Amino acid sequence: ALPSIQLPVDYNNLFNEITDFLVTFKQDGPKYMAMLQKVANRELNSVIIDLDDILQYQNEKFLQGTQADDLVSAIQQNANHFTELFCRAIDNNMPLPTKEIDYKDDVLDVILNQRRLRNERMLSDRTNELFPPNLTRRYFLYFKPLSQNCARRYRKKAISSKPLSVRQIKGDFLGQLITVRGIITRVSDVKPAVEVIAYTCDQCGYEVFQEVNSRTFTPLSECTSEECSQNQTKGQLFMSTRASKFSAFQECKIQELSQQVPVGHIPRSLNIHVNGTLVRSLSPGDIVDVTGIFLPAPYTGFKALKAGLLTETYLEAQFVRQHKKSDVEERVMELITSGDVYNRLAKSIAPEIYGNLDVKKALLLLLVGGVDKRVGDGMKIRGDINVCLMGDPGVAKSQLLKAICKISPRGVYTTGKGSSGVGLTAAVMKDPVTDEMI
Amino acid sequence: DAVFGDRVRRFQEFLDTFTSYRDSVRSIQVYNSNNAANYILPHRIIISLDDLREFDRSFWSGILVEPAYFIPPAEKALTDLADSMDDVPHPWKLSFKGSFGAHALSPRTLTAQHLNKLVSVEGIVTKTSLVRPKLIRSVHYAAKTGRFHYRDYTDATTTLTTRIPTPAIYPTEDTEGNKLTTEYGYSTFIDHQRITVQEMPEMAPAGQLPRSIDVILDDDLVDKTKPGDRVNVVGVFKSLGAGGMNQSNSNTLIGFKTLILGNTVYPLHRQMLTDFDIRNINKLSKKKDIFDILSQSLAPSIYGHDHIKKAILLMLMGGVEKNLENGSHLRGDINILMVGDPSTAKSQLLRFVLNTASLAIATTGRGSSGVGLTAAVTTDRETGERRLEAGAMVLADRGVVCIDEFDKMTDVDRVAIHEVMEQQTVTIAKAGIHTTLNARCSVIAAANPVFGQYDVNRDPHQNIALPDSLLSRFDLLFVVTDDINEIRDRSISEHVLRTHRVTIPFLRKYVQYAKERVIPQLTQEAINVIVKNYTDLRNDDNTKKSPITARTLETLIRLATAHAKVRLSKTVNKVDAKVAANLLRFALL
DNA sequence: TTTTTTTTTTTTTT
Numbered sequence A: 001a002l003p004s005i006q007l008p009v010d011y012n013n014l015f016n017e018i019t020d021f022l023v024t025f026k027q028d029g030p031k032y033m034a035m036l037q038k039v040a041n042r043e044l045n046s047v048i049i050d051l052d053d054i055l056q057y058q059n060e061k062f063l064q065g066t067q068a069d070d071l072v073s074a075i076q077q078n079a080n081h082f083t084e085l086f087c088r089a090i091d092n093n094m095p096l097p098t099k100e101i102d103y104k105d106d107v108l109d110v111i112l113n114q115r116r117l118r119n120e121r122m123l124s125d126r127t128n129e130l131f132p133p134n135l136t137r138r139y140f141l142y143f144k145p146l147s148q149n150c151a152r153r154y155r156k157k158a159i160s161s162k163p164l165s166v167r168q169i170k171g172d173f174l175g176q177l178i179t180v181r182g183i184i185t186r187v188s189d190v191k192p193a194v195e196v197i198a199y200t201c202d203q204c205g206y207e208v209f210q211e212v213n214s215r216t217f218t219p220l221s222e223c224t225s226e227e228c229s230q231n232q233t234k235g236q237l238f239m240s241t242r243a244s245k246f247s248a249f250q251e252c253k254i255q256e257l258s259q260q261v262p263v264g265h266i267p268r269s270l271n272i273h274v275n276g277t278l279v280r281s282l283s284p285g286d287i288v289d290v291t292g293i294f295l296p297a298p299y300t301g302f303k304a305l306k307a308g309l310l311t312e313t314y315l316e317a318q319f320v321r322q323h324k325k326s327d328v329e330e331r332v333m334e335l336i337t338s339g340d341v342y343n344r345l346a347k348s349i350a351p352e353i354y355g356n357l358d359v360k361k362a363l364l365l366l367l368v369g370g371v372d373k374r375v376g377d378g379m380k381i382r383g384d385i386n387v388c389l390m391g392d393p394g395v396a397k398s399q400l401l402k403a404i405c406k407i408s409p410r411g412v413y414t415t416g417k418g419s420s421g422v423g424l425t426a427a428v429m430k431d432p433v434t435d436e437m438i
Numbered sequence B: 001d002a003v004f005g006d007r008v009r010r011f012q013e014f015l016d017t018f019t020s021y022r023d024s025v026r027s028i029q030v031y032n033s034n035n036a037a038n039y040i041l042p043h044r045i046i047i048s049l050d051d052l053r054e055f056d057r058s059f060w061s062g063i064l065v066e067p068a069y070f071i072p073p074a075e076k077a078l079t080d081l082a083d084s085m086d087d088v089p090h091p092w093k094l095s096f097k098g099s100f101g102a103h104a105l106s107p108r109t110l111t112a113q114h115l116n117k118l119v120s121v122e123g124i125v126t127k128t129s130l131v132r133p134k135l136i137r138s139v140h141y142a143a144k145t146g147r148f149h150y151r152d153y154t155d156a157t158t159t160l161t162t163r164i165p166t167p168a169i170y171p172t173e174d175t176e177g178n179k180l181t182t183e184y185g186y187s188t189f190i191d192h193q194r195i196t197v198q199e200m201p202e203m204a205p206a207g208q209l210p211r212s213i214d215v216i217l218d219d220d221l222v223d224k225t226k227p228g229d230r231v232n233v234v235g236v237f238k239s240l241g242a243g244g245m246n247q248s249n250s251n252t253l254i255g256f257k258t259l260i261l262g263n264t265v266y267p268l269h270r271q272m273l274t275d276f277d278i279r280n281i282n283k284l285s286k287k288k289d290i291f292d293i294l295s296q297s298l299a300p301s302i303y304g305h306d307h308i309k310k311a312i313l314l315m316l317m318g319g320v321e322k323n324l325e326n327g328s329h330l331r332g333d334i335n336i337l338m339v340g341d342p343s344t345a346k347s348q349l350l351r352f353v354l355n356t357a358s359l360a361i362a363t364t365g366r367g368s369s370g371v372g373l374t375a376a377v378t379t380d381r382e383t384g385e386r387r388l389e390a391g392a393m394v395l396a397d398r399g400v401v402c403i404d405e406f407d408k409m410t411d412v413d414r415v416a417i418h419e420v421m422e423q424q425t426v427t428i429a430k431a432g433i434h435t436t437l438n439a440r441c442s443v444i445a446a447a448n449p450v451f452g453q454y455d456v457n458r459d460p461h462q463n464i465a466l467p468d469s470l471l472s473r474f475d476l477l478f479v480v481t482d483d484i485n486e487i488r489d490r491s492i493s494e495h496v497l498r499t500h501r502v503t504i505p506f507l508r509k510y511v512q513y514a515k516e517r518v519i520p521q522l523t524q525e526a527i528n529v530i531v532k533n534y535t536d537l538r539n540d541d542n543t544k545k546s547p548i549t550a551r552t553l554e555t556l557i558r559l560a561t562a563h564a565k566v567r568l569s570k571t572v573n574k575v576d577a578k579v580a581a582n583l584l585r586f587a588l589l
Numbered sequence C: 001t002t003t004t005t006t007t008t009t010t011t012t013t014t
């Protein structure tokens, strides 16, 4: 019944290494001692733990002995447990006071304050097994990748590292923290999810905390509390939505680069979850180096349908690196003193296309447009320059527009089909997937 | 299962005797660690079955016959052996070859006896049920009691042998009740797939239609093969599933849908040039009339039209490519169209571009939905996932699309056809997934005169049959007259009569090589001429006919570049441009 | 002990 076999991997000492990893360090006082505080100080939420300093810290833990067991490779080979352990010890050395906490001020801050004060005080009357550590956090943990120029220490192969295609993505990559690159598509809107989630009880009260594990769970009422229980008959209990905590969740698919792919083989988009402070980080149609923990989430179901179990998996967000993110009037002041603002900047329009600066000349009128006017009643007199092109076939006039919207403020580059009637007139185009009728 | 070990110690003798397999065995065992010295190898081995009759025929036959009783211990034997190999610093797999067989058969037929036996079965790949990774081994970590805990899950599709319904739940707090966390990044997941194969349509016996059957692809076999490819697929044909008799449902005759597990999946018709061959490729490459030569051999029956032939080979190279940095590409592949009175051999001419060309797929008019457009397989198929599937033009990526009656295609298709050529991609909004996927393709078609034989009499305007931007993207429009010369007609007759009554295969072996080695880039010598030529066109070709654009000049680039690959010159040269100046004259006159 | 499904093809129609 469930055979069990030893392996070189042991969490026991690694925990200790994590304690010495945080709050004890120099090269980057250290970053792990007072920034952790600044989280407990409530000026910051995201805990950014770099694979960089895991490497440099193993430079402190090896070279520079005494030698220590593997980290970044053990990390990216598992990727999930290291947020449940490396982060769990953070509770121990976190600064107490910390500074200027107040209470309310913040809503629910007094709730949890008086949660554990009414908890300990109602536990003080009974004494005259505790709210889980994940309940009080208010900080997310984000690992970031090591490319790296200092990964060249080197551990060589162990670096991924590479932003491989989803075609390159494999089944052995389950439970592996990796880099992936690709376009954002459909980017589900941010929604709360859940975390513990304390449901109150009716007669003698108390409380119980149902862990939030997986994607779904069974709700429960009965009575757990010994006093409402068995007398009489059972204390009723309901969920308290202000006793709940919600981790931030926005799931977004990321499509393949399309040049990563073999010539046939339609693009394969992959499923990703967002958690935490990194919410809102990703917007539609955006290429990014996205690193994250990739885990199976079966099933619901179906079930006996699948078989084999055929996981279907998903990705969770960890880190985001996005490609391509007065003294400004002074930056303008070589142009102000340049003279010939109108003809010169008219030459500056689409410098690629040769000839017909007479056309660019009017395009210049467009980029600025203006000024409108308001008649005082009022009804606007444009104010807006509607100028059209002509002649054919190619001319690469498309380039004139192509650069114009690329540069001109709030531009829309369109065509006949192209932007439709409903591509121009707000209607009720049923929303695909996430619903509905947006 | 003492006999299970008997198959192994029988085959154990086969280990190291003969040892000719251990070379590649060791090789895997080395190149893996050589990638481990870097700064990827599959675990499985091709075994020519041919050798095994030289040890045990008594073992031989059953390998095909009852592989469930034979292949898993020899499977174990590969692993056993390789494990006995160095060094300390996985279940593996097999393929074989054939050397067949009974068991030689095509997918058109199968069962009864053919079931439960190793078989090689070949053909068209469709529709490509798309990839999802699959669960196999479970693992968990107890605390504080620690240790390491695990399960092993087995689907009916895994291995061969029937086994108890393992699925499907995590062991989850095995006694004593200690918490057990999933080991992710530990426990095993092999990817799985099910890929049907349609028998070749042309080898179909009668009016009866093509029948595909599925074959499961585990581990490596996935992503090896796209739809539409000719593939010999070998493996063991499983009897799978309940007979409807598992339950009261359903009371009926029907049942036992079945497929083939494993094994090899070879593509067929790349290629293999050795040395002695490519030495001929280059020996011929030295000769300066070879362009015309290669052109003539294209159409064994067909009369002349050598300018069209040349044009075709010019499309057969691909004419390189150049991708801008941080900007849109300059299309290098060549798109042409044929037009003329019926019996020009235009369709039949397309059928030559059917075989030598190394893909792509040809179509008669219709066509659609959106051709290469996926048209959004709906809904799902399967497990709640809406899916796309390879369309014609997509399947044709980096290959030859050909069209019978491009004039007879819908006006609605034409939209995406513009999208096929300039934009050179595929935009999909339909349900749906918004992917823009590369449509880059070499495309040639044929259109008949809109009205009768007036192709020659009427102006090109109204003779187009497919205006307008469609005309721009075309590198060449070829008017071919059915016009009569009795002088010519004698010639027309005799070769046509000796019909029913310089080598092409090598031409494919050469073209393929000229693609990857090498791209010519450019020299200014072509440039110092074709410019003069283009302006010469604009100041002249408008005193004759139309059209003229910058694009038609960009074809001078592509044309010259095509012949540049034909010379196998490391660079573009002036005389190649002279080949272009040749081709466009006859293009418009 | 039950699970869960709207495009694409063709059609007849003002």
Ligand SMILES: Nc1ncnc2c1ncn2[C@@H]1O[C@H](COP(=O)(O)OP(=O)(O)NP(=O)(O)O)[C@@H](O)[C@H]1O
Pocket (backbone or CB within 6 Å): B301, B302, B303, B340, B341, B342, B343, B344, B345, B346, B347, B348, B349, B404, B448
């Ligand atoms: N050298 C040749 N030149 C022309 N036709 C040939 C030649 N050799 C054979 N043929 C025959 O000529 C016919 C060509 O028909 P073809 O024009 O290719 O089909 P099609 O164009 O689709 N019919 P249509 O659409 O009306 O033009 C076939 O029957 C060929 O076998």
